[PDB]
Design a protein around this ligand. Structure first.
Ligand SMILES: CO[C@H]1[C@H](O)[C@@H](O)[C@@H](O[C@H]2[C@H](O[C@@H]3CO[C@@H](O[C@@H]4CO[C@@H](O)[C@H](O)[C@H]4O)[C@H](O)[C@H]3O)OC[C@@H](O)[C@@H]2O)O[C@@H]1C(=O)O
Ligand SMILES: O[C@@H]1[C@@H](O)[C@H](O[C@@H]2CO[C@@H](O[C@@H]3CO[C@H](O)[C@H](O)[C@H]3O)[C@H](O)[C@H]2O)OC[C@H]1O
Ligand SMILES: [Cl-]
Ligand SMILES: [Mg+2]
Length: 348
């Protein structure tokens, strides 16, 4: 399978949802053990999912994930300690809407990281310590984390994770850092945190790609730039959106562009062969680039195993039929999978 074809290059990973990680699905257990040598929990280790609004913890799914990776001797990536999404407003705010103090939030961060990274110390090889801290306007993301703490939210998160599990490979992770603008903003941020002495080992490029954009040349500039920081590069959340895009619409449509419209969901009956071809070529281009820079890259993780479970079926438009991954809704390899294998089978 893929993990073997790519053994000399980098880990091949998949994000697993709670149903899959339960181990109840023997077909998927077989597929995963064959194809992947790394896994990431799709949701169950996110603050707002693992803990309720009162801060109470329920370990059922997170423990099942770690047991699944242990059972199959898979490399495991914790996702994610400090992020502005899927986390209760109660972490940052009094019930009246006012923010708590930096000191009060620091205490909560300390408890969360010490508990979560502590529980799985030595079991998870790597952590996404901070996710998505640069805004799309190229300034620091205006999250509650940042408004309350400043860049100390990042510095302290990494320092804490490193104290709790000194052996964990610590990563900063973000999307659209494949692109000019956000790439350079991220380099600048990381550079200066590193100089300040922040422990950090890896840089995660999410790799939520379109069927066309961004171009290989842009992704290449990012691999090279982030490697120059003395960080291992990981592609962490790979998928290829094949459906009509709403990211670039006229101002009149800004509000309604996330509305379900039949014309925006054109492949409910199946993805036609011509698009299978385009998808295969796009993945082949991508993996050619990864092979080229294999010396810089530790891992390529897909954000899901098969199309039926992809978050792109519901994002950014609910209820679409997307085709973003290497296995179809019947768990059969798509044309893209075979192109990926051929790149290695036939390597000179
Ligand atoms: C309220 O938060 C919003 C974010 O502001 C928004 O960026 C988005 O965040 C998602 C993230 O979505 C990215 C957005 O960018 C896409 O890339 C575009 C492709 O078309 C090109 O022409 C554009 O130039 C590109 O920007 C990319 O495909 C998406 O994946 O994905 C990662 C998520 O964790 C993050 O939430 O959406 C959220 C939101 O609505 O929740
Ligand atoms: O109804 C809830 C859903 O809203 C929720 O969707 C998850 C949102 O997060 C996605 O993963 C992110 C994808 O983008 C980046 O790569 C981030 O780093 C990822 O965390 C999940 O794939 C979706 O499943 O799921 C929970 C549910 O209760
Ligand atoms: Cl899940
Ligand atoms: Mg172990």
């Amino acid at each position: 399978g893929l993990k073997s074809a790519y053994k000399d290059n980098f880990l091949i990973g998949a994000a697993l949802n709670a149903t899959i990680a339960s181990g109840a699905d023997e077909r998927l257990n077989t597929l995963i053990a064959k194809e992947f040598n790394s896994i990431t929990p799709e949701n169950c280790m996110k603050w707002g999912v693992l803990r309720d609004a009162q801060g109470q913890w329920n370990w059922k799914d997170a423990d099942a994930f770690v047991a699944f990776g242990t059972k199959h001797n898979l490399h495991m990536v914790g996702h994610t300690l400090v992020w502005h999404s899927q986390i209760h407003d109660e972490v940052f705010k009094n019930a009246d809407g006012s923010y708590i103090s930096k000191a009060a939030l620091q205490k909560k961060m300390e408890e969360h990281i010490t508990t979560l990274a502590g529980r799985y110390k030595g079991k998870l090889a790597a952590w996404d310590v901070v996710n998505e801290a640069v805004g799309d306007d190229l300034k620091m993301r205006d999250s509650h984390w940042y408004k309350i703490m400043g860049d100390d939210f990042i510095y302290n998160a990494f320092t804490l994770a490193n104290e709790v599990d000194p052996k964990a490979h610590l990563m900063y992770n973000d999307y659209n850092i494949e692109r000019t603008g956000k790439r350079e903003a991220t380099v600048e941020m990381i550079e200066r945190l590193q100089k300040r002495g922040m422990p950090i080992h890896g840089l995660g490029i999410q790799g939520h790609l379109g069927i066309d954009t961004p171009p290989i040349a842009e992704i290449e500039k990012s691999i090279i730039a982030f490697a120059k920081l003395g960080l291992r590069v990981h592609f962490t959340s790979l998928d290829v959106d094949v459906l009509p895009s709403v990211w670039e619409l006229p101002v009149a449509e800004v509000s309604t562009r996330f509305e379900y419209k039949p014309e925006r969901d054109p492949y409910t009956k199946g993805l036609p062969q011509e698009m299978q071809d385009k998808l295969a070529k796009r993945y082949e281009d991508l993996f050619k680039l990864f092979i080229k820079h294999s010396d810089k890259i530790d891992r390529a993780t897909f954000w899901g195993v098969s199309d039926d479970a992809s978050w792109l079926n519901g994002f950014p438009i609910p209820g679409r039929t997307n085709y973003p991954l290497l296995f179809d809704r019947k768990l059969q390899p798509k044309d893209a999978y075979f192109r990926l294998l051929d790149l290695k089978r036939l390597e000179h």
